Amino acid sequence: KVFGRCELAAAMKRHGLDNYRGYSLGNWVCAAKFESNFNTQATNRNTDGSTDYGILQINSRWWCNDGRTPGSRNLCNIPCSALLSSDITASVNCAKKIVSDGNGMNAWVAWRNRCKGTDVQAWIRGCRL
Numbered sequence: 313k314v315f316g317r318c319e320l321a322a323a324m325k326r327h328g329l330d331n332y333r334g335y336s337l338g339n340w341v342c343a344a345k346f347e348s349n350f351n352t353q354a355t356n357r358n359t360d361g362s363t364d365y366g367i368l369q370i371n372s373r374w375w376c377n378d379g380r381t382p383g384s385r386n387l388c389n390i391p392c393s394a395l396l397s398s399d400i401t402a403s404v405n406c407a408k409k410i411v412s413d414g415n416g417m418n419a420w421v422a423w424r425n426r427c428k429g430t431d432v433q434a435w436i437r438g439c440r441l
């Protein structure tokens with residue numbers, strides 16, 4: 313599923329991401345934009361053999377099991393494939409664990425490089441929330 317900007321913002325809000333650990337909704341939407349282009353089926357392989365999955369590109373070395381990343385942990389306790397679904401529930405639940413992991417949203421390289429220190433509120437302007 314490829315989400316619309318406002319549609320994703322609403323789903324993210326319903327799942328309790330607005331101001332989660334102090335990050336307003338704008339940050340989450342911006343991160344999803346630049347990580348996956350709002351596409352739940354996005355996958356990208358990394359040089360270390362791990363793969364990033366779904367709307368927020370969650371990584372197979374620490375957070376999910378894809379059965380091909382040796383010495384991986386499975387901290388969100390899910391198959392990585394569940395992160396590709398049109399239902400973003402598992403992605404949001406796992407991202408909450410990630411963002412609580414001490415480094416906040418800096419775990420997402422696209423957020424740090426392209427959202428952090430910008431006007432993230434612009435990513436939900438216009439939306440009915």
Ligand SMILES: [Cl-]
Pocket residue numbers: 333415416417
């Ligand atoms: Cl933080």
Ligand code: NA
Pocket residue numbers: 372373374375376377378381383384385386387
């Ligand atoms: Na893993």
